[PDB]
């Protein structure tokens, strides 16, 4: 169970970018994938989470600049950050949950990253 | 202010109940209708409380963390056997949900019965109080009792094909756990079907 | 009634203009909003 | 925002404790803190999930406990090979916040 | 007034509470028949467009104010702008019956043609959200199915509409401001 | 001053089902008078209710022959009016035009065998809550059913109760829905004595509470 992400090169400021996180030996129908990035010299920052039942949660600040799409059959998660700025330069991680994560439209950061007993985190 | 309800032969008394709230009606609409041509027989062996466990109210869950139970839920009781053996049945939902806390933790939880429940949008959750509902908080009442008459487009609808009422529990305020207060609060529902009728006896295997 | 405002008996009978309605021999939210606890709850000064 | 010491140095064979300082809104809100150890140039591993239970496939030497508003990750008999950056993932109000991170050096 | 407020008792407090006086209210324009008896455009209209509500755009007046109620019941007054003979069938008719001209058809009048088709669905009262299949709402809910050579526009008007079981109405989202701040007339 | 009509636009176009009568283009003519003419029927439904019609079956024969094998179910058919078994019957034909129907449907079974041959038949109506109707009468005994012995009175009439989630059920089953809108009706022969090569005639007629509405004219 390994996660592989594909990222572009330098993206010009004021453009979008599409990163695709390709799961392996993984359900994506009973598990959830999150998107976390680390701007250098800063702490990690939850971008957004896609649950098992394709319900999405987004970082309140980077919300409206960001979309996340999941396809269970093709078994790949996608991230599209619109309006890229020089501040958004970072290394972008995708993670696994240990549970489905909230199938609601909760509106929190990830919402499940360190929730309770059942759902915590999985091999990035 | 105790309240000692009763359904069939089981009773549930809560000494912290704040009041029964009827949803959309007080008494169910007429039962013998153009359909079933009078083949409906009111079953009463099925008005019985059946416990169900729900989400363990934990402080981690933020505002808008709705937990939904669809009624009627899988039942191993007489009512569960009745839905399997009867093609069409109608019953009042009468949902009762009790969350027990030490009362030193302040958390506001909204429990509502919503007909034709749909994934509710985050913005819709703010306006979720329109449906019959009660607020469960450790500070005053640990038990919420809601009585809702069964309402459906058809007079009788097969429960397996479609379920009209889904109990929804929403954490309006994240539980404020304190050293004196309970670390986490569980949420159990004492649901009971009321005015349960059936029709069209269905052949068993 | 609704948005009808013409002061004249409708030309067509009810059966043809609208779908006649049957009964089985209300306004719950008006009942609710009317049974609405108003005023104070304790002694006023 | 889950501030942690920039650099923590522990002599090999000596127990080392990493402290993640958090506010009442996030770390203090509940005992649901996740600790992630990330080796430079590789994906991070969740050493502790829920702040009281070691994750499956993780060494038993790591011990996790949270008191008040501060969550502390303790490593016993720390080894030079296992040295890596440590992040104290926790849940804030309306978002998930991750600790700045602590650099681990073995003398 | 400090009610119990966790028993969900409608407690409405008037301005008399603090030496005021509450005026008279006239709520004719927020009645649920007068606010529904106005037309609304259904898009997109193809030939054999099944004439059911909830095709109306979510945010339009009759659209949202309807989705604010689970179960609705109304008689329509359809307004079609077609290019040929326009046939409407009761909600149960097979699609084949849309060409047979003995069921209600309206011949091209020069402008659009206005027809007042009754409520033909079999269900007691329709629904806006259905829970469980038969999760999409069933075919039976549709009021009626129309068909013409081509249908340019189509308006729908719910006469003697009566709604039930209210639902969230969802006013426009606003961020980074205190009011919505739209260009007013 | 001439009154201003202010005639409306987009309405008043001639409609095939429009109620308004056409303007007279000829003078009053007195037609030949018929008083109490025989066989006049005011309502189509009354004619269907008054006279039962036969149902189609394997080999296109209305009578259902006694099984020559150990099977107690002579025939099982869908309650929906647009069914192969009821396609031939007159009641389905009048009902085919109406969009939806309501009320009990009466089934008339009349034994057509020699006096020496005696058989017992059970007609059971099964609601649509199961994938398929049972092949055994005891399994189908739980649902509404009528068992009639064959004696001096050859014809036994069983009224099928109409029970459905919808108040009115569409006469024609949707192509998309493989299962019937209404539950299957099954006719069974629990006991047959010397009934080899014996035929039982079954007919279907409109019930007292049976009614139809929203009439349309689709291709038949």
Structural domain boundaries in chain B: 1-205
Q: Does the distance separating the beta carbons of F167 and B87 come in below 8 Å?
A: no
> How distant is the Cα of B86 from the closest Cα of chain C, in angstroms?
24
Q: Is the CB of E170 inside 8 Å of chain B's CB atoms?
A: yes
Domain residues for the domain of C43 are 1-45
Cα B193 to Cα B182: distance, rounded to the nearest angstrom: 31
Cα E53 to Cα E42: distance, rounded to the nearest angstrom: 8
Cβ B134 vs Cβ E8: under 8 Å: yes
Cα B156 to Cα D9: distance, rounded to the nearest angstrom: 71
Among B84, B151, B203, B204, the residue to mutate for chain F (most F Cβ within 10 A): B203
Calculate the CA A58 to chain-centre distance.
9
Q: Does the distance separating the beta carbons of D89 and A114 come in below 8 Å?
A: yes
3-state SS, one letter per residue, for F71-90: CCEEEEEECCCCCHHHHCCH
| Structural method | cryo-EM
Q: Does the distance separating the beta carbons of B33 and C24 come in below 8 Å?
A: yes
Q: Which domains does chain A have, with CATH numbers?
A: 4-96 (2.60.40.10)
Q: Is the CB of D101 inside 8 Å of chain A's CB atoms?
A: yes
Sorted by sequence, the CB contacts under 8 Å of residue F175 that are 6+ apart come out as: none
Element (H, E) at F120: strand F118-125
E82 preceded by cis ω (within 30°)? no
Q: Does the distance separating the beta carbons of D29 and B60 come in below 8 Å?
A: yes
Q: What is the dihedral of CA B54, B56, B57, B58, to 10 degrees?
A: -160
B2: number of Cβ within 10 Å:
8
DSSP assignment string, B133-163: EEEE-TTS-SEEEEE-----SSSSB-TTT--
Q: Is the CB of B33 inside 8 Å of chain C's CB atoms?
A: yes
Q: Where are the domains of chain D?
A: 7-106
Cα D62 to Cα D80: distance, rounded to the nearest angstrom: 14
Q: Rg for chain C (alpha carbons), in Å? A: 21
Q: Is the CB of C6 inside 8 Å of chain E's CB atoms?
A: no
Sorted by sequence, the CB contacts under 8 Å of residue A48 that are 6+ apart come out as: A34, A35, A56, A57, A58, A59, A62, A63, A66, A68, A79, A110
Q: Which two tokens stand for residue B202?
A: 């269905």
Cα E157 to Cα E170: distance, rounded to the nearest angstrom: 22
Q: Does the distance separating the beta carbons of B58 and D30 come in below 8 Å?
A: yes
Q: Does the distance separating the beta carbons of E122 and F10 come in below 8 Å?
A: no
C24-33: long-range pairs with CB below 8 Å, 24+? C24/B30, C24/B33, C28/B24, C28/B25, C29/E166, C32/E10, C33/E10, C33/E12
Element (H, E) at B41: strand B41-42
Q: Which residue of D has its CA nearest to A57?
A: D95
Q: Is the CB of A24 inside 8 Å of chain D's CB atoms?
A: no
Handedness of CA B135, B140, B142, B146 (dihedral sign): negative
Q: Does the distance separating the beta carbons of E122 and F218 come in below 8 Å?
A: no
Which regions of chain E does DSSP assign to beta strands (E)? Answer: 40-41, 50-51, 69-76, 78-82, 86-89, 105-106, 113-115, 144-147, 151-156, 158-166
Cβ F199 vs Cβ F63: under 8 Å: yes
**Chain B residues with CB-CB distance to E162 below 8 A:** none
Q: For the structural domain made of D7-106, what CATH number should be given?
A: 2.60.40.10
Q: Which residues pair with E11 in a beta bridge?
A: C37
Cα E77 to Cα E81: distance, rounded to the nearest angstrom: 13
Q: What is the resolution of this structure in A?
A: 3.7
Among C21, C22, C24, C33, the residue to mutate for chain B (most B Cβ within 10 A): C24
Q: How many domains does chain C have?
A: 1
Q: Which two tokens stand for residue F151?
A: 């004696």
> How distant is the Cα of A26 from the closest Cα of chain D, in angstroms?
17
Cα A120 to Cα D91: distance, rounded to the nearest angstrom: 11
């Amino acid at each position: 169970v390994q996660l592989r992400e594909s990222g572009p090169s330098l993206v010009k400021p004021s453009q979008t970018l599409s990163l695709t996180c390709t799961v392996s030996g993984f359900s994506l129908s009973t598990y959830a994938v999150y998107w976390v990035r680390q701007a250098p010299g800063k702490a990690l920052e939850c971008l957004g989470s896609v649950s098992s039942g394709d319900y999405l949660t987004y970082n309140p600040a980077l919300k409206s600049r960001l979309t996340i799409t999941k396809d269970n059959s093709k078994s790949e998660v996608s991230l599209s950050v619109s309006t890229v700025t020089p501040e958004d330069t970072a290394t972008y991680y995708c993670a696994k949950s240990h549970s489905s994560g909230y199938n609601g439209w909760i509106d929190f950061g990830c919402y499940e990253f360190t929730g309770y007993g059942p759902r915590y985190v999985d091999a990035w | 202010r105790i309240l000692t309800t009763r359904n069939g032969h089981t009773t549930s008394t809560t000494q912290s109940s704040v009041g029964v709230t009827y949803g959309y009606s007080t008494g169910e609409d007429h039962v013998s209708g153009p359909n079933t041509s009078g083949l409906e027989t009111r079953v009463v062996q099925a008005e019985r409380f059946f416990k169900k466990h729900l989400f363990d109210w934990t402080t981690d869950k933020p505002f808008g963390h709705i937990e939904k139970l669809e009624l009627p839920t899988d039942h191993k009781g007489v009512y569960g056997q009745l839905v399997d053996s009867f093609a069409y049945m109608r019953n009042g939902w009468d949902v009762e949900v009790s969350a027990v806390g030490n009362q030193f933790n302040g958390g506001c939880l909204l429990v509502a019965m919503v007909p034709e429940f749909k994934e509710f949008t985050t913005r819709e959750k703010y306006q979720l109080t329109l449906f019959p509902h009660q607020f469960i908080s450790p500070r005053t009442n640990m038990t919420a009792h809601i009585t809702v008459p069964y309402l459906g487009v058809n007079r009788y609808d097969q429960y397996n094909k479609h379920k009209p009422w889904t109990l929804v529990v929403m954490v309006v305020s994240p539980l404020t756990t304190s050293s004196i207060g309970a670390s986490q609060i569980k949420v159990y529902t004492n649901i009971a079907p009321t005015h349960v009728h059936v029709a069209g006896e269905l052949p068993s295997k | 009634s609704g948005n009808t405002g013409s002061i004249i008996n409708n030309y067509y009978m009810q059966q043809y203009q609208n779908s006649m309605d049957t009964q089985l021999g209300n306004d719950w939210f008006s009942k609710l909003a009317s049974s609405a606890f108003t005023g104070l709850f304790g002694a006023l000064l | 925002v889950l501030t942690q010491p920039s650099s923590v140095s522990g002599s090999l064979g000596q127990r080392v404790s990493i402290t993640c300082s958090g506010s009442s809104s996030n770390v203090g809100l509940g005992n649901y803190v996740s600790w992630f150890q990330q080796i430079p140039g590789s994906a991070p591993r969740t050493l502790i999930y829920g702040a009281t239970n070691q994750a499956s496939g993780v060494p038993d030497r790591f011990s996790g406990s949270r008191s008040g508003n501060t969550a502390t990750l303790t490593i016993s008999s720390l080894q030079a090979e296992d040295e890596a950056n440590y992040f104290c993932a926790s849940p804030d109000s309306s978002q998930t916040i991750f600790g700045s991170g602590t650099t681990l050096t073995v003398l | 007034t400090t009610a119990t407020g966790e028993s969900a008792d409608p407690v409405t407090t008037t301005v008399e509470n603090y030496g005021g006086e509450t005026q008279v209210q006239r709520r004719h324009h927020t009645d649920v028949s007068f606010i529904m008896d106005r037309f609304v455009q259904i898009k997109p209209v193809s030939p054999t467009h099944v004439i059911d509500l909830m095709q109306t755009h979510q945010h339009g007046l009759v659209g949202a104010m309807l989705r604010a109620a689970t179960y609705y019941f109304s008689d329509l007054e359809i307004v079609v702008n077609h290019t040929g003979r326009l046939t409407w069938v009761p909600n149960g008719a097979p699609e084949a019956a849309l060409d047979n001209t003995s069921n209600p058809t309206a011949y091209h009048k020069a402008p659009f043609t206005r027809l007042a088709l009754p409520y033909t669905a079999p269900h007691r009262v329709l629904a806006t959200v259905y829970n469980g299949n038969s999760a999409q709402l069933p075919a039976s809910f549709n009021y009626g199915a129309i068909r013409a050579t081509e249908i340019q526009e189509l308006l729908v008007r719910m006469k003697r509409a009566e709604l039930y079981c209210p639902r969230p109405l969802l006013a426009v989202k606003v961020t980074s401001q205190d009011r919505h701040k739209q260009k007013i007339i | 001053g001439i009154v201003p009509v202010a005639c409306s636009d987009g309405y008043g176009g001639l409609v095939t089902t429009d109620p308004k009568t056409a303007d007279p283009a000829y003078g009053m003519v007195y037609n030949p008078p018929r008083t109490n003419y025989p066989g006049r029927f005011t309502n189509l439904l009354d004619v269907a209710e008054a006279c039962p019609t036969f149902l189609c079956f394997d080999d296109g024969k209305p009578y259902v022959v006694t099984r020559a094998d150990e099977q107690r179910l002579l025939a099982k058919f869908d309650l929906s009016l647009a069914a192969k078994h009821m396609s031939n019957t007159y009641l389905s034909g009048i009902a085919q035009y109406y969009a939806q129907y309501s009320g009990t449907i009466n089934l008339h079974f009349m034994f057509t065998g020699s006096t020496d041959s005696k058989a017992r038949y059970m007609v059971a109506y099964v609601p649509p809550g199961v994938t398929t109707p049972p092949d055994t009468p005891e399994r189908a005994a739980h649902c509404i059913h009528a068992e009639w012995d064959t004696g001096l009175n050859s014809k036994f009439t069983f009224s099928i109760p109409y029970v459905s989630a919808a108040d009115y059920a569409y006469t024609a089953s949707d192509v998309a829905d493989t299962t019937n809108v209404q539950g299957w009706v099954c006719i069974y022969q629990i006991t047959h004595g010397k009934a080899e090569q014996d035929t039982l005639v079954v007919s279907v007629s409109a019930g007292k509470d049976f009614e139809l509405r929203l009439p349309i004219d689709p291709r038949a």
